[PDB]
Enzyme design. Structure first.
Site, PDB file in Angstrom:
ATOM      1  N   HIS A  61       0.833  -1.213   0.000  1.00  0.00           N
ATOM      2  CA  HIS A  61       0.000   0.000   0.000  1.00  0.00           C
ATOM      3  C   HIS A  61       0.864   1.259   0.000  1.00  0.00           C
ATOM      4  O   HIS A  61       0.524   2.267  -0.638  1.00  0.00           O
ATOM      5  CB  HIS A  61      -0.932   0.023   1.221  1.00  0.00           C
ATOM      6  CG  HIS A  61      -1.859  -1.156   1.292  1.00  0.00           C
ATOM      7  ND1 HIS A  61      -2.877  -1.359   0.377  1.00  0.00           N
ATOM      8  CD2 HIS A  61      -1.926  -2.196   2.162  1.00  0.00           C
ATOM      9  CE1 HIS A  61      -3.519  -2.479   0.671  1.00  0.00           C
ATOM     10  NE2 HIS A  61      -2.966  -3.004   1.752  1.00  0.00           N
ATOM     11  N   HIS A  91       5.155   6.851   7.268  1.00  0.00           N
ATOM     12  CA  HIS A  91       4.952   6.459   5.883  1.00  0.00           C
ATOM     13  C   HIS A  91       4.433   7.678   5.149  1.00  0.00           C
ATOM     14  O   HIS A  91       4.059   8.674   5.776  1.00  0.00           O
ATOM     15  CB  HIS A  91       3.884   5.366   5.784  1.00  0.00           C
ATOM     16  CG  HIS A  91       2.555   5.790   6.325  1.00  0.00           C
ATOM     17  ND1 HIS A  91       2.143   5.498   7.610  1.00  0.00           N
ATOM     18  CD2 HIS A  91       1.551   6.501   5.761  1.00  0.00           C
ATOM     19  CE1 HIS A  91       0.941   6.013   7.814  1.00  0.00           C
ATOM     20  NE2 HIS A  91       0.562   6.629   6.708  1.00  0.00           N
ATOM     21  N   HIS A  93       2.084   9.254   1.507  1.00  0.00           N
ATOM     22  CA  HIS A  93       1.148   9.084   0.408  1.00  0.00           C
ATOM     23  C   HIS A  93       1.626  10.035  -0.678  1.00  0.00           C
ATOM     24  O   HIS A  93       2.123  11.104  -0.358  1.00  0.00           O
ATOM     25  CB  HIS A  93      -0.253   9.482   0.828  1.00  0.00           C
ATOM     26  CG  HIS A  93      -0.757   8.720   2.009  1.00  0.00           C
ATOM     27  ND1 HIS A  93      -1.450   7.532   1.884  1.00  0.00           N
ATOM     28  CD2 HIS A  93      -0.642   8.953   3.335  1.00  0.00           C
ATOM     29  CE1 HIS A  93      -1.779   7.090   3.089  1.00  0.00           C
ATOM     30  NE2 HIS A  93      -1.289   7.928   3.985  1.00  0.00           N
ATOM     31  N   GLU A 103      -3.063  13.902   1.131  1.00  0.00           N
ATOM     32  CA  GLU A 103      -4.397  13.539   1.603  1.00  0.00           C
ATOM     33  C   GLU A 103      -5.162  14.754   2.152  1.00  0.00           C
ATOM     34  O   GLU A 103      -6.277  15.047   1.732  1.00  0.00           O
ATOM     35  CB  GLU A 103      -4.248  12.444   2.653  1.00  0.00           C
ATOM     36  CG  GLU A 103      -3.675  11.179   2.054  1.00  0.00           C
ATOM     37  CD  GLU A 103      -4.084   9.934   2.815  1.00  0.00           C
ATOM     38  OE1 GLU A 103      -3.878   9.917   4.053  1.00  0.00           O
ATOM     39  OE2 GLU A 103      -4.615   8.971   2.193  1.00  0.00           O
ATOM     40  N   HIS A 116       3.182  10.948   7.163  1.00  0.00           N
ATOM     41  CA  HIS A 116       2.428  10.679   8.391  1.00  0.00           C
ATOM     42  C   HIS A 116       3.281  10.007   9.425  1.00  0.00           C
ATOM     43  O   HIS A 116       3.785   8.914   9.183  1.00  0.00           O
ATOM     44  CB  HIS A 116       1.217   9.781   8.093  1.00  0.00           C
ATOM     45  CG  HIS A 116       0.129  10.500   7.373  1.00  0.00           C
ATOM     46  ND1 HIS A 116      -0.844   9.848   6.633  1.00  0.00           N
ATOM     47  CD2 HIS A 116      -0.135  11.822   7.261  1.00  0.00           C
ATOM     48  CE1 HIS A 116      -1.649  10.744   6.084  1.00  0.00           C
ATOM     49  NE2 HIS A 116      -1.266  11.951   6.483  1.00  0.00           N
ATOM     50  N   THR A 195      -6.586   6.866   7.649  1.00  0.00           N
ATOM     51  CA  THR A 195      -7.029   7.161   6.281  1.00  0.00           C
ATOM     52  C   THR A 195      -6.917   5.932   5.388  1.00  0.00           C
ATOM     53  O   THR A 195      -7.192   5.990   4.195  1.00  0.00           O
ATOM     54  CB  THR A 195      -6.215   8.295   5.635  1.00  0.00           C
ATOM     55  OG1 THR A 195      -4.888   7.840   5.380  1.00  0.00           O
ATOM     56  CG2 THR A 195      -6.169   9.529   6.540  1.00  0.00           C
ATOM     57  N   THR A 196      -6.494   4.822   5.968  1.00  0.00           N
ATOM     58  CA  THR A 196      -6.599   3.531   5.303  1.00  0.00           C
ATOM     59  C   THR A 196      -7.482   2.642   6.157  1.00  0.00           C
ATOM     60  O   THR A 196      -7.587   2.857   7.355  1.00  0.00           O
ATOM     61  CB  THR A 196      -5.227   2.891   5.183  1.00  0.00           C
ATOM     62  OG1 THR A 196      -4.534   3.061   6.422  1.00  0.00           O
ATOM     63  CG2 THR A 196      -4.445   3.592   4.060  1.00  0.00           C
TER      64      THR A 196
HETATM   65 ZN    ZN Z   1      -1.040   7.836   6.132  1.00  0.00          ZN
END
Ligand code: ZN
Ligand code: CL
Length: 257
Positions: A61, A91, A93, A103, A116, A195-196
């Site tokens: 992911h 991690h 995005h 995000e 994040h 958010t996942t």
């Molecule tokens: Zn995140």
């Protein structure tokens, strides 16, 4: 299984995870005119001197840099938070190009990526118990914008070639996450969610006003990762972000005027 594709992406997550349509979902668009200054919000306290990084993993992911969260001095506290939260992993995005990938958005502006830094509330014993509570986690979000290179990011970007597919990992000791922080700790804060999936509403979001500058070449290395495992046909890991969700009955506060 969930993902970021047409058929298993964020628009589909609610089927397996009905909280996706909940009252405190993340990310959100941050409207800088309506976010309210709260001059009672204490400075953020970020203590990463004893942060002890362990490994970096392609989890299919994104990639996570994992920390030894028994290190009881490696903590976030202050700001809007009661008590102490321990760094477990960070991690990112990112997008299929520099014009999208974050995000959170700020007045509808999307950034090339978003970092994040995930922390859990020590009062709940471990991460697994904390995610089941509304004040279980604190995530420190930091926007990436293309510009000068970020020296503290280079060790991350250079190791990605060896963890290019799902399941691959690398030892990754002595990484100092202080090298990823902008000059200013001014922030916006609001209660929200992972958010996942499982999208649990257990997070106090702390999103810094100031983005870090990373170079175009650094961010393009994120996009060379693949979602698929070794021995499937390459499936480039890009646009692994969830879009802004309804703010519903929440107020975003700002630590600054
Ligand atoms: Zn995140
Ligand atoms: Cl580079």
């Amino acid at each position: 299984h969930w993902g970021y594709g047409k058929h298993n992406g964020p628009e589909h997550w609610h089927k397996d995870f009905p909280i996706a349509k909940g009252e405190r979902q993340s990310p959100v668009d941050i409207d800088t005119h309506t976010a309210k200054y709260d001059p009672s919000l204490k400075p953020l306290s970020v203590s990463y001197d004893q942060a002890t990084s362990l490994r970096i993993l392609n989890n299919g992911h994104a990639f996570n840099v994992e920390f030894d969260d028994s290190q009881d001095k490696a903590v976030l506290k202050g700001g809007p938070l009661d008590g102490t939260y321990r760094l477990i992993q960070f991690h990112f995005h990112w997008g299929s190009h520099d014009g999208q990938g974050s995000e959170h958005t700020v007045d509808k502006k999307k950034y090339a990526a978003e970092l994040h830094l995930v922390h859990w509330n020590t009062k709940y014993g471990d991460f697994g118990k904390a995610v089941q509570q509304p004040d279980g986690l604190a995530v420190l979000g930091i926007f990436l914008k293309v510009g000068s290179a970020k020296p503290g990011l280079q060790k991350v970007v250079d190791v990605l070639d060896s963890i290019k597919t799902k399941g691959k990992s690398a030892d990754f000791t002595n990484f100092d996450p202080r090298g990823l922080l902008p000059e200013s700790l001014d922030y916006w804060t609001y209660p929200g969610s992972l958010t996942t999936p499982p999208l649990l509403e257990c997070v106090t979001w702390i999103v810094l006003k100031e983005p870090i500058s990373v170079s175009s070449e650094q961010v393009s290395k994120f996009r060379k990762l693949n979602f698929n495992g070794e021995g499937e046909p390459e499936e480039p890991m890009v646009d692994n972000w969830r879009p802004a969700q309804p703010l519903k009955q929440r107020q975003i506060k700002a630590s600054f005027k």
